[PDB]
Amino acid sequence: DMIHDAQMDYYGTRLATCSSDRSVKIFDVRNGGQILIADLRGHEGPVWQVAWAHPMYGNILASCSYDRKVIIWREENGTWEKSHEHAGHDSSVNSVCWAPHDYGLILACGSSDGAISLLTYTGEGQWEVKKINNAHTIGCNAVSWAPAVVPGQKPNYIKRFASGGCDNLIKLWKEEEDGQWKEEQKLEAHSDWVRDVAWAPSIGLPTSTIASCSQDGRVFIWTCDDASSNTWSPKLLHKFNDVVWHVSWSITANILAVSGGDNKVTLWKESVDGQWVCISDVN
Amino acid sequence: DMIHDAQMDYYGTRLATCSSDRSVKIFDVRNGGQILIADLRGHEGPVWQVAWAHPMYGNILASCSYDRKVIIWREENGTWEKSHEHAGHDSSVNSVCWAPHDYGLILACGSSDGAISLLTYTGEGQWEVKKINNAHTIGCNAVSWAPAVVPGQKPNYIKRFASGGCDNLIKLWKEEEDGQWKEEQKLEAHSDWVRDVAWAPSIGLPTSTIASCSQDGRVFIWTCDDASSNTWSPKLLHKFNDVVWHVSWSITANILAVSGGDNKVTLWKESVDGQWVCISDVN
Amino acid sequence: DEIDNAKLIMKERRFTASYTFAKFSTGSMLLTKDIVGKSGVSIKRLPTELQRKFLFDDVYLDKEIEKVTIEARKSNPYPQISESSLLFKDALDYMEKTSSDYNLWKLSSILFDPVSYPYKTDNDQVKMALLKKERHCRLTSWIVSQIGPEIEEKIRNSSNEIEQIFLYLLLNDVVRASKLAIESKNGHLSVLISYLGSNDPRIRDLAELQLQKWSTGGCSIDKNISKIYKLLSGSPFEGLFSLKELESEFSWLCLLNLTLCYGQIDEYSLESLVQSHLDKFSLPYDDPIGVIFQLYAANENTEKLYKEVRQRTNALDVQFCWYLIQTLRFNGTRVFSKETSDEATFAFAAQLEFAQLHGHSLFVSCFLNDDKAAEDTIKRLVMREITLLRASTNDHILNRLKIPSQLIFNAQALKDRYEGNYL
């Protein structure tokens, strides 16, 4: 009936989907045409967000759900099975996201109880779970990983990742070089539930950005002028008289796709003048 | 083919129209249905804006044009004729507007040469023309009259009226208690041609406002807190990636109808929070 | 072969292919250019954003006038409201008992609509303590009717009689909660359950001083027998064996019923009492019956809260806002500003404009405090829609509202004058 999130695969071939009926379908789009392939059923509640892993580790898809569980589906020649599952949270799990392929293979999941887990991968069917209890007050909705920025070979990374919640704060995070994550900062400006948070992927440029949308109907694009400037100054994109649900970044012109409001979808580009404009409405 | 401006009459019965074919048509809308009545031809060039006068003076309609002339059409029992004409400007005449019915019957016309005329009415087929030479640099586009605000009986009014132009400035004006108009102030912020200027009619409230749109694609709402001192602080409504053409004020909730951009028309309302939002798109 | 100036004039003006226009008109209706008109003037009207059926019937607008006293202001003849006996109760009748509406309304009709002794006893220390409670009951007696199915049914679920009792208490049903205590051979409960309705420090301490000892090395006691003793302690949520844990399965409004029935933590005003429950718990998002409580809870900062609440206010109906501010303003119930009042009166009086209902527009508009704007609006509203306000909208409204004689004649003639040359 109604689908929730749907993300295309890496090389732009398959396309995973999931909706309230607890079913994660994986179509495949060779030449504009859709063609379902598998229907992975396994959640006692609707599935929320879905995320494909970097083809560097075979072909992996991961889906989270209101069933308090997260499933990771592997593939071994047409064989779409479950190579692991993680039910380490007490409530719904609103979102999932994979860390840039350099930090290895790490999945970041935020639940509706206010926690966050971080599945790292170790050799075989084994997954450790360094978890962040009470990271948000009422719960967590969005999780987005900060771009893979480089500092013996295979350097240590400032493994950061943001995440907004129901407490109205968009907390950034950092892996302390010892073992655990400590929230590097909180971002306030949203007057209601932070619906989604998206770490715009640095086009090589050092001006790292981040965008967020919430029930109030505002989309802010937070910014760190420089590196270690500790500073994130929010700027308003636009306020609609209804809630904004998702926000994803285009890949090159930093075109923000704003999904929220009137069942519509808008696009925005930062103009040569600092101000953000709507380039087109989508339907 | 393509119409330019079209304004309904006072009691909401007739509806004057005009388009590039130099023809000013006057339909009449008794019960949602349109019904043309007269086709007043009289301009050697397309007609731009049109304006109905207050029924207090019989039924008058006035249309300006690129033909450097302004026509005033009277009515005397189905008799739609011309009771006067004024060709006092050297170029196109982009807009016309009637002064609040208290200042008598005055028409304000701005031409493309940079001037402005002010037809006042005296007893019979006679019209004086106190004109404002070089009021704008490249030309004038919009003319809007300030609300009829009250200060022997029949008090003297601070007869003001704004008007944007091609010089990017939105100059307000004032009738010096002697006889002529002197520009009370200039309003800069528009980076290109001021397309239209609309003096939002004070809902009894003393917070007089004004809105303007221009080729840059911005709409500013100049709000002023006047304690006898001009201090008009512009605020941005929205910038579109294309030109905005017209702007008219609703009559009670100060709902701004924004006509410009994608052939679309949007509506805006100042929310309890200071920021302006789009309430609906019109089509 | 001659459309060359339509390339120079169109190009000399900067006039691009996409030139569109839209303008509102006095009748408060926009005109955007669509190929859908003889000339191309799609004359769309502006949608009211108001949804409540009884506004379209004269009987309401009519009857609701009789509720007021109109008097010309001190700076002109334009009418303004002197005295209005307008209670939320009034509204109750024109609605159906099912909608959250009847609730939101019937609730305020309790929280704010005034309570009163019916006979004529005059002991202020008493009459003040009676209404203090007549309101107390009326409120719980209501919540008992909302959590009704919610719990009444949760009881068909338990082969644990002790738990059943505690659930019967939740429904402020001491009688059937006691009938059970005895019928199960759990008599000592029926006793306490008796004291439950009143405040006795002996019992208070006997339950609490008891509870403290219950966490030593003495288990196998029902979570329910304790929950019940807890109801005697006085404050069940900030308790030594708190009930804050109930939150997971009981809708917030059930817990509240507890803080109001057993939660008497102090013998003070009900208003701040409600405010106490809120301090410990959050509340349903987008819920009007919820907001209404906050509005009743924050008693002195009403306007400060209302305004503060109005920023996430898509739950509180513009008509309700208006109606609230006015039932509070004309009964002396709460503190409201002139700016906020009229601010929210244009709000409503405008939707009614947009709903071609100039009976309501004009009527509401008389609630304006600003003699300038009041005159200002009325002159406008009438000057334009006289015919619409005459011979059939029940024939009188204008005079019924003490409008000015000169304006009626003045504006009327103006139109007959107009129609004079159109016919």
Next chain:
Amino acid sequence: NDVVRASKLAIESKNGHLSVLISYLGSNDPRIRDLAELQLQKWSTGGCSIDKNISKIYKLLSG
């Protein structure tokens, strides 16, 4: 001795002031006591015009 269903009714009939007393009924408060009795005495003057039931109920408060 069923105060709860006796009150649910008092309010459902637009006879609210009862539901109030019915509340005090379960406990001893001299204020109420006198408010019902001092009231009753006045009820036999010239207006012997109220339900035999409303009185019977106030009577339950007299003591």
